[PDB]
Amino acid sequence: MLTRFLGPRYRQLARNWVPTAQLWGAVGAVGLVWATDWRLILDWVPYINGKFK
Amino acid sequence: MLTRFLGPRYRQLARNWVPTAQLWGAVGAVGLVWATDWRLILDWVPYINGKFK
Amino acid sequence: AEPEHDHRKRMGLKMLLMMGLLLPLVYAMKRHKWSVLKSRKLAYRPPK
Amino acid sequence: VAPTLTARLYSLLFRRTSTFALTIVVGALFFERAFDQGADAIYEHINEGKLWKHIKHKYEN
Amino acid sequence: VSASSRWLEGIRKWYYNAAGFNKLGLMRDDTIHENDDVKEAIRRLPENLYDDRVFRIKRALDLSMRQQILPKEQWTKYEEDKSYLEPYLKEVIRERKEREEWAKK
Amino acid sequence: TNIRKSHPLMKIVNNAFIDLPAPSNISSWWNFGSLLGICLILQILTGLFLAMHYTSDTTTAFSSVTHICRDVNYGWIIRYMHANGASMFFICLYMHVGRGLYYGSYTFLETWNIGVILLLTVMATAFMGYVLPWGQMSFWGATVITNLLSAIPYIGTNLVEWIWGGFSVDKATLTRFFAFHFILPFIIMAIAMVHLLFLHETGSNNPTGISSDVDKIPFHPYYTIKDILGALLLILALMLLVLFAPDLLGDPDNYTPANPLNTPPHIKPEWYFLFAYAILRSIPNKLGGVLALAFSILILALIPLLHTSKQRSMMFRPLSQCLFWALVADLLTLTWIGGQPVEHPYITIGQLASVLYFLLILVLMPTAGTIENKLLKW
Amino acid sequence: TNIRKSHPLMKIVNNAFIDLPAPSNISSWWNFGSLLGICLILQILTGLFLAMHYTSDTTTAFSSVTHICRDVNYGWIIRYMHANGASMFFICLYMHVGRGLYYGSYTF
Amino acid sequence: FVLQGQWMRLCTSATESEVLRGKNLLRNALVSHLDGTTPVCEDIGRSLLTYGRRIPLAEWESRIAEVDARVVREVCSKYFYDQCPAVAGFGPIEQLPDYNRIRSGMFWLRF
Amino acid sequence: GRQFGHLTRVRHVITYSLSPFEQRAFPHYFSKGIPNVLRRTRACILRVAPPFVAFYLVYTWGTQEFEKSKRKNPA
Amino acid sequence: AAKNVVSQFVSSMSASADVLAMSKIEIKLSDIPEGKNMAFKWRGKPLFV
Numbered sequence A, B: 001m002l003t004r005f006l007g008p009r010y011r012q013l014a015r016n017w018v019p020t021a022q023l024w025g026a027v028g029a030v031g032l033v034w035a036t037d038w039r040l041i042l043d044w045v046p047y048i049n050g051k052f053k
Numbered sequence C: 001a002e003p004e005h006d007h008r009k010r011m012g013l014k015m016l017l018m019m020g021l022l023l024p025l026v027y028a029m030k031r032h033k034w035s036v037l038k039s040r041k042l043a044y045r046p047p048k
Numbered sequence D: 001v002a003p004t005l006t007a008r009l010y011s012l013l014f015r016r017t018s019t020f021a022l023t024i025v026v027g028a029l030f031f032e033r034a035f036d037q038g039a040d041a042i043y044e045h046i047n048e049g050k051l052w053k054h055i056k057h058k059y060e061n
Numbered sequence E: 001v002s003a004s005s006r007w008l009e010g011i012r013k014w015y016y017n018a019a020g021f022n023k024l025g026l027m028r029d030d031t032i033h034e035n036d037d038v039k040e041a042i043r044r045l046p047e048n049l050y051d052d053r054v055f056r057i058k059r060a061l062d063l064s065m066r067q068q069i070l071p072k073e074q075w076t077k078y079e080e081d082k083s084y085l086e087p088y089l090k091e092v093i094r095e096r097k098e099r100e101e102w103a104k105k
Numbered sequence F: 001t002n003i004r005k006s007h008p009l010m011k012i013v014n015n016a017f018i019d020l021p022a023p024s025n026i027s028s029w030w031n032f033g034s035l036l037g038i039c040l041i042l043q044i045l046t047g048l049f050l051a052m053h054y055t056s057d058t059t060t061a062f063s064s065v066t067h068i069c070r071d072v073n074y075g076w077i078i079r080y081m082h083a084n085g086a087s088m089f090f091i092c093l094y095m096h097v098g099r100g101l102y103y104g105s106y107t108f109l110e111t112w113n114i115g116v117i118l119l120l121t122v123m124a125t126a127f128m129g130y131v132l133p134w135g136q137m138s139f140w141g142a143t144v145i146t147n148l149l150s151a152i153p154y155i156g157t158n159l160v161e162w163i164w165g166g167f168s169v170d171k172a173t174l175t176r177f178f179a180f181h182f183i184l185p186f187i188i189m190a191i192a193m194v195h196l197l198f199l200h201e202t203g204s205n206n207p208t209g210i211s212s213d214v215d216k217i218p219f220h221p222y223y224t225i226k227d228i229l230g231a232l233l234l235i236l237a238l239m240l241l242v243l244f245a246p247d248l249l250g251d252p253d254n255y256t257p258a259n260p261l262n263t264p265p266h267i268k269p270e271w272y273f274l275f276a277y278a279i280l281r282s283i284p285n286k287l288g289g290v291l292a293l294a295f296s297i298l299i300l301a302l303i304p305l306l307h308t309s310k311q312r313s314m315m316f317r318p319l320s321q322c323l324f325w326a327l328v329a330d331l332l333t334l335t336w337i338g339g340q341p342v343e344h345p346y347i348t349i350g351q352l353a354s355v356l357y358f359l360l361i362l363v364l365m366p367t368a369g370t371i372e373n374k375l376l377k378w
Numbered sequence G: 001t002n003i004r005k006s007h008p009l010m011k012i013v014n015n016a017f018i019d020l021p022a023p024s025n026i027s028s029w030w031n032f033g034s035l036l037g038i039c040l041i042l043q044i045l046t047g048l049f050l051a052m053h054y055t056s057d058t059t060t061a062f063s064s065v066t067h068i069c070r071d072v073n074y075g076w077i078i079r080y081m082h083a084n085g086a087s088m089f090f091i092c093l094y095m096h097v098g099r100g101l102y103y104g105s106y107t108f
Numbered sequence H: 001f002v003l004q005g006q007w008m009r010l011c012t013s014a015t016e017s018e019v020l021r022g023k024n025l026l027r028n029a030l031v032s033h034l035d036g037t038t039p040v041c042e043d044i045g046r047s048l049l050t051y052g053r054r055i056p057l058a059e060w061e062s063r064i065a066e067v068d069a070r071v072v073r074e075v076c077s078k079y080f081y082d083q084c085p086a087v088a089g090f091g092p093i094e095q096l097p098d099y100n101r102i103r104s105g106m107f108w109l110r111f
Numbered sequence I: 001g002r003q004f005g006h007l008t009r010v011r012h013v014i015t016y017s018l019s020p021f022e023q024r025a026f027p028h029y030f031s032k033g034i035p036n037v038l039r040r041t042r043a044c045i046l047r048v049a050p051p052f053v054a055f056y057l058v059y060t061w062g063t064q065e066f067e068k069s070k071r072k073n074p075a
Numbered sequence J: 001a002a003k004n005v006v007s008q009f010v011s012s013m014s015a016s017a018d019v020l021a022m023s024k025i026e027i028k029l030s031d032i033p034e035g036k037n038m039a040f041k042w043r044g045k046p047l048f049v
């Protein structure tokens, strides 16, 4: 019965909020990465190679 | 400046509440006595001589 | 008696540098927001 | 390259709260490293008593 | 009347200046602590005085906030210091005291 | 409608930290309320992490405390943050009470009286805290203190032995003190909420002591950030203490394990009780000493009855200011004396300062208020 | 005005246990909320008294629990009230959730 | 709160249907107003002082027709998003929100 | 309780304000600033300072008497 | 009932493996010369001879 949110306006709504939902996810990611010191993900970043090898 | 509560009515008030303030004190006393098992005070009561000597 | 001695002073050094950076900044943040009030001007205009 | 400078920072990154956050998080990452090494080296210079001595004892393992 | 009265009057003037409400354009009655008797007297004030009293308090709280003070010429001068509240407060107290006498009998 | 304003949970937040009408002119001195808030949480958080390694048994008590500082990762800061936070909690507590006294804030009876209960509670809390490491000062402090209660006629011996769990400060006594030191700060918090509940019926007082309904501002940009800036200042003070001088306010003797046969020549409280300690020993009597010790704290409950001035604050009252500062100065003397042996100078000055403390609050300050009223023709 | 209705502290009590409009037909099954309330306090109280003798060290943990049941005056009931109260807390908890499920209470 | 909430919504999430309504309300306003010798005469005089031309209805239509949601959220953003307002209050205004709060309602943390 | 809009009655008071983004956070900071602190200091020294020196003096004397007392010449 | 549960919780803070009091220490007098105060441990308390 979630057919209430299915139409052109809602489709326009979703798009208007995508760059924002996408940028919020970049915030969440880097934020998770930097806070746990994600070895796997971090080692690829040019500077911040404070784990030598 | 507690001279507000000094007069015939307040004097009548005090008396009307005396038997009550007195009986409340009897309640408080026996209540204290029976709850701590006041040796000194209890030993005089006829029955309740469950401390023999 | 105090094995942590050195490491603590290294943190303490960092605590002083951080504070020296943070203190003025938070102060400026707070002054900026208090601005509205500090320069507010009042006027009394009664009838007659 | 000065009036337009904080202007660009605002235009490209501070306007949206999206970027604003992304920038301080990207900004927290680099800063941590620069402050850490930068302050270690200041703690390093005013001393020279700890593990500068390491070169001796070890290596013989 | 003479030397002595002026000396007590100048001691009072001295305390006044030291008290420093004048520096914030306040009047003595603007500094009174608000109990019921006082809350009622404020209520009984006429429109003009009430409005003036709020502006003064506001002027002072504002000054007190930025910890500044008024230029010396705008300080309230002692005995140019109208005790606008007094007569109202006095009557409110007198009214309360009568209630109190009646409450004793 | 909004979301903040209507939601059952958020309402409470909104009405306490967002839209709360606050006076526009409160100064630092009003920050100590939030700072006590921070100190309370800081004490609870570092307090919990310590409880994850601490042992409440005399056999391993000291050792577990040592285990924390050498072996437990970052156990040492946590331990010193705890120790120094307790002192920070008392500096803030004292500022707060003093602020209330100078400014007339005590006229909010329930708020203030609840505040007295909060003072007593953190005091009872910190005393039990200090015994936990089981140092020489922990044990002899525990001994000297509890034994005071033996001056209470006919009930005192049984009372002291009841809280001891024996005839001395032993095994039963340490574990006991752990449990109470764990539960007390939670109760404190529930009371701090009731404190804030009563405070909300009127809102805050301000430096002038004059009503501020005429000029209120939202707590929402102004006091959130001013409290923030202020907590940062509390952190500086605390961290300066812990990362540079962690024993400065501490006693080097509580580092020697408890020895029920070795009485140190020293024997003094933690600094925050030194004034009360000085008042206690100024009296050549067992009962009177503890009767006056108690009265030096419970007197805060008599203060609102001794308000005599027609103005609320001290901002406009010079004579009263002098008397107030003489109270603070007298309290330095009291702590200083309290931290000194009961030999020459010290006895008579600490004896007279005790009289002054009570002459000041009980007679001098009220009399000044009457005089001041008179000078103003009020 | 009253005293119950107006006092900041008593209001809360009044609005929660005195004048609170309650449905006239709730049955036992509605009692488990107050019973969980009692179990919570019972767990805290006996829990505190146990903490006055219990040791958190592997060396003396069991022994301290034994010390309580033989040596500590009335230590044994306190210990069993604690243990059994934890079970009572779960019987009530389960009644409560079930009551909510049967009756549709979850719609809140 | 509601006023500001609408400006931001439009700054960020303006949808197409409402923009057609806006355009439609505007086409009606334009034409309904230019009814009678008086409003038109006024229109001619004022236009020439400000535009140097008389802008024919067909052109205003063209300019209106070109507006879609994207334009609204871009044009509203430019003028409203995170900008300082001029606020004027008169009457019983104890509850007029503080300036900082009105200023903080000019941007959104969602966005 | 409290709220805004139910505090008190105020009439005929205008309040001009300016946005925080249009003014400086530290206007005459050292210029007007320092004079003010000196003035605030003058206003209060005579009320704060004296009690404290009285202690300062009682402290140094108190210490001297004590230390000098644990010494002795004849008898 | 209230008495009893309250009394029991109150009593839980007194006795234990703390009934000890044996001691009755025998002290050799020739070990303490003239002018000396020798302290011993007696019933958990210091005893001066």
Ligand code: HEM
Binding pocket: F029, F030, F031, F032, F033, F034, F036, F037, F040, F093, F096, F097, F100, F103, F105, F106, F108, F111, F112, F113, F114, F115, F116, F117, F118, F119, F122, F188, F192, F195, F196, F199, F203, F204, F205, F206, F300
């Ligand atoms: C756990 C200890 C305490 C906490 C958490 C606490 C928290 C607070 C908070 C948050 C405020 C509002 C902001 C402020 O003025 O600082 C406040 C104000 C106040 N507190 Fe406390 N406080 C505590 C201890 C005390 C003590 C010891 C007293 C004095 C017996 C006290 C009496 C007051 C009074 C009268 C006010 C009103 C002050 C005014 O508005 O001018 N409280 N407190």
Ligand code: HEM
Binding pocket: F043, F044, F045, F046, F047, F048, F050, F051, F054, F065, F079, F082, F083, F084, F085, F086, F087, F089, F122, F125, F126, F127, F129, F130, F131, F132, F133, F181, F182, F183, F185, F186
């Ligand atoms: C419920 C939160 C708290 C817990 C769980 C807690 C737990 C502990 C523990 C396990 C110890 C022994 C470890 C040690 O000595 O470092 C201790 C010591 C102490 N705590 Fe707490 N405590 C809490 C809140 C407080 C409060 C409110 C105060 C009062 C400011 C306080 C002041 C002290 C003091 C003075 C000491 C002894 C000094 C020292 O650190 O060595 N703590 N606490």
Ligand code: HEM
Binding pocket: G029, G030, G031, G032, G033, G034, G036, G037, G040, G093, G096, G097, G100, G103, G105, G106, G108
């Ligand atoms: C510490 C555990 C709990 C306590 C103290 C607690 C306390 C209460 C109290 C006092 C009531 C009102 C009287 C009653 O109907 O019983 C209540 C009702 C309710 N509780 Fe709990 N309860 C707890 C656990 C739960 C659980 C586990 C659930 C289910 C997830 C639950 C969901 C409900 C619901 C929906 C109601 C409304 C029932 C109705 O009105 O018909 N609560 N609770």
Ligand code: HEM
Binding pocket: G043, G044, G045, G046, G047, G048, G050, G051, G054, G065, G079, G082, G083, G084, G085, G086, G087, G089
């Ligand atoms: C903060 C209040 C509580 C405290 C201070 C506390 C403290 C203790 C202590 C010291 C023990 C070890 C002594 C023993 O085993 O008898 C224990 C055991 C236990 N407690 Fe708690 N507890 C509290 C609340 C709870 C709660 C809420 C529950 C959950 C119903 C709970 C369930 C248990 C259980 C199941 C045991 C182990 C079984 C046993 O009694 O041997 N207690 N508790």
Ligand SMILES: COC1=C(OC)C(=O)C(C/C=C(/C)CCC=C(C)C)=C(C)C1=O
Binding pocket: F120, F123, F124, F127, F130, F140, F141, F142, F144, F145, F267, F268, F269, F270, F273, F276, F277, F280, F293, F294, F297
């Ligand atoms: C042995 O060293 C001492 C302490 O450190 C352990 C103290 O803490 C105190 C004072 C403590 C309190 C709780 C006084 C308050 C009493 C009441 C009734 C409020 C004294 C005197 C002391 O000698």
Ligand SMILES: COC1=C(OC)C(=O)C(C/C=C(\C)CCC=C(C)C)=C(C)C1=O
Binding pocket: F016, F020, F021, F022, F023, F026, F030, F031, F033, F034, F037, F038, F040, F189, F192, F193, F196, F199, F204, F219, F223, F227
């Ligand atoms: C308008 O006056 C007030 C302030 O300005 C001086 C405050 O700063 C605070 C701060 C209080 C906080 C953050 C709550 C802390 C309490 C606990 C139990 C954690 C309150 C309540 C207040 O009324």
Ligand SMILES: COC1=C(OC)C(=O)C(C/C=C(\C)CCC=C(C)C)=C(C)C1=O
Binding pocket: G016, G020, G021, G022, G023, G026, G030, G031, G033, G034, G037, G038, G040
């Ligand atoms: C009208 O419905 C209700 C009842 O009848 C079924 C209750 O019996 C209770 C009892 C709740 C109590 C006594 C509070 C206990 C909570 C704690 C944290 C101790 C409530 C709230 C209620 O709403």
